[PDB]
Design a binder for this molecule. Sequence first.
Ligand SMILES: C[N+](C)(C)[C@@H](Cc1c[nH]c(SO)n1)C(=O)O
Lengths: 440, 436
Amino acid sequence: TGPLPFGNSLLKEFVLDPAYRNLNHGSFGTIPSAIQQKLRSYQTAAEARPCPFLRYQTPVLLDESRAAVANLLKVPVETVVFVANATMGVNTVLRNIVWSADGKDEILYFDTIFGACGKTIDYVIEDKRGIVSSRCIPLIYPAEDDDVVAAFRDAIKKSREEGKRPRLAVIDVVSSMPGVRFPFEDIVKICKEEEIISCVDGAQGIGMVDLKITETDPDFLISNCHKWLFTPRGCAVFYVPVRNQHLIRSTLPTSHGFVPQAGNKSAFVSNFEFVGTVDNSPFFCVKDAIKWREEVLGGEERIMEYMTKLAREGGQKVAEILGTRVLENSTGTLIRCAMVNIALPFVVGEDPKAPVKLTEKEEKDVEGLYEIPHEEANMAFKWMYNVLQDEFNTFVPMTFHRRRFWARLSAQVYLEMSDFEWAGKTLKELCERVAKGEYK
Amino acid sequence: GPLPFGNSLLKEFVLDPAYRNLNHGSFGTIPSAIQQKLRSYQTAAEARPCPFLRYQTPVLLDESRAAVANLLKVPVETVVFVANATMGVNTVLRNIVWSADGKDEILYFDTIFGACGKTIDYVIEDKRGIVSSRCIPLIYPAEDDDVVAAFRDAIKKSREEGKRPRLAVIDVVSSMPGVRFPFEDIVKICKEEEIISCVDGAQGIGMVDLKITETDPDFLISNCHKWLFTPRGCAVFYVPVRNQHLIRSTLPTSHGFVPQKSAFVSNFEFVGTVDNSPFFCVKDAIKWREEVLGGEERIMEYMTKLAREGGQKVAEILGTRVLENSTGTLIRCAMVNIALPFVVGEDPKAPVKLTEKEEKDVEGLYEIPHEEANMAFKWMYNVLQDEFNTFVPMTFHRRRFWARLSAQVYLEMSDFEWAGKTLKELCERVAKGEYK
Ligand SMILES: C[N+](C)(C)[C@@H](Cc1c[nH]c(SO)n1)C(=O)O
């Protein structure tokens, strides 16, 4: 005998509501029933002998999860620690960077940055008083990989032309909205060519795609284990190479491990073990999830290849149903993850305060589609979220990009092709309802 | 009706029957009925993730906020939930805009919690010296007037050096040692001197009356998971609406931040993806403590009365004393400190000249050399669990070790007699040099 087959037969191993269809695993993730049992096993041990377990078994269990995730990512264990989530990790980097005294440091970032990380940038500048500022790089999707590379090299060239210093850049592994594989290998590589700190936001990363940490060699990398590695909610892996760990002077929040102003566990690794009393049972389950995905399922590569294959083929099915298309570039490099974006068969029309000149391909593509007006776009956007939840018992996040709604579907090992055919209707049935102005 | 207190109440908890929890104040524990609430919220989250986590989270957060604000007798618009007390005080210190002249000073007492004290050090490092601090040393047993006078002088001395006392962090109940702190007198002085009163009340809710309305602090944090029978990883953050604008960003910064139901309350709903089931259980722990245990007033009345009579029993057994001032105001919480019957040799680099009463209380007592003080401290911690199946934190103060015992509603006098005999035999083996 061997690993379990994928598809709806795998739902027996999970704890989803059978009447609910989880097309949006990429937002909060979920865990199999066995990992939920492990999580409550750590809860039980924590309340049986609180002080003996929380004081001296927390470092032991953390080190077991650190060695389990480090071998998966194929990095030295001394380079990985656990934090609350991707939002927490990104702040740990941005709040710790000592900016140059001359006030020219600039944070380069793309306009598809996760909203929380973007607002973390906005405030870091407010709190740090304008010693640093930010330059947003507008990306146009579907985006060819070389055009993204070109726009980032153009932002550096422009930054220096205004006498400023591109200091740090945040880079997605897989972007949130739209759910798209980002060419982070090239942008990270040029960050070192131009001596720019690479802060890799890879929240949509571990468990879904190969992060290639040893090869890309980033200065910092964040990734949510609870998103695609079946780790309980509230866990991210924080990778820092030893050359740059001295820059993480304080954790978030500051705790006992901080040092103001031999030869065992490093002070960096020690500082992340106790950062305030929390439930660490999700951190403990990381070694269980990696074990379960390997022993019960085929392993990481068999998991990832199925999801990506299902994301392309299934995204293509809902695209052929709706009569639109998938979000993809000419190199086929955007759908290199478990998520896929499909355009909905209508448009919202020009907004006068912010007009959009679409390319010929985009205008040509919309010919014949039904058009609602722009005042009702936000109203229709909220109406589709409730109806999907209330009538259809599902959730589908949608990206509003250039007068098109792009639905983001996320494939997973407990899903199959019939789950997209169902997604085809619901989106098409519901899109037939917005054309009839039902949201009013 | 109300359940009786004592060892019979251990039925309702899920502690190891071989383990004696004398150390509730460190991490707390929850009854089984709150454990099944925690797992219910966890199960609802995994059943329908996006529908439950996006739209049922704010409703459940508001239900716990209404419950925790109703018990604090404060407006619901004043309270939000943060991860822990450490996270709460980091939210205050990391948001305060310090004066441009670089004269602002953070005032604190040397009994501050280590993480909170370390937070001051980093903030000073993070703000590149635009703000500094001043540590007020304290000697325990500390009379309330001496603490107030040490704070008044710190204010007077701060101004005499061209500095401005800007912010003071005040304990409701200190950690090590576990003592009720005269925060009411210190917060009132903070108002008169126009000093931000950042009240660290981690050892607070469920254990002592915080009298927030009377004291009217600028900020207050308190761990529900310590003494409110709330699952681990929960602290209630109180902010009056007059300073809510000072809290610019949560920790970490999330969607609710506004770059330059109120926005302050909304900003704390979604602050990075976490397990919020501990926050959701606050409403249930409060309701369980009301019906099953008989109400909030009855619980903390029993625990401190038990801490007094139990702490005195331990002191009688060891032949030493409880940590208490002449007013009897230190043991006004569910914790008590008892001196152990030995002494540490004088540290030659950091000599501590004892008062006459301190030196007479240590006469005839066995003495450990200071070079062995850390070795004996680690030995007692290992033996207390491996051989006695319990944990007792000890405060090293003025060449003495003070053991901090945490009273609880599931304990009774027989538990503190056990601790006294356990500690007596433990120190007898220390006197024999067993730690070598
Ligand atoms: C064991 N520990 C949680 C790391 C703490 C001990 C401790 C006691 N009480 C608390 S509550 O945050 N922590 C430390 O040693 O710094």
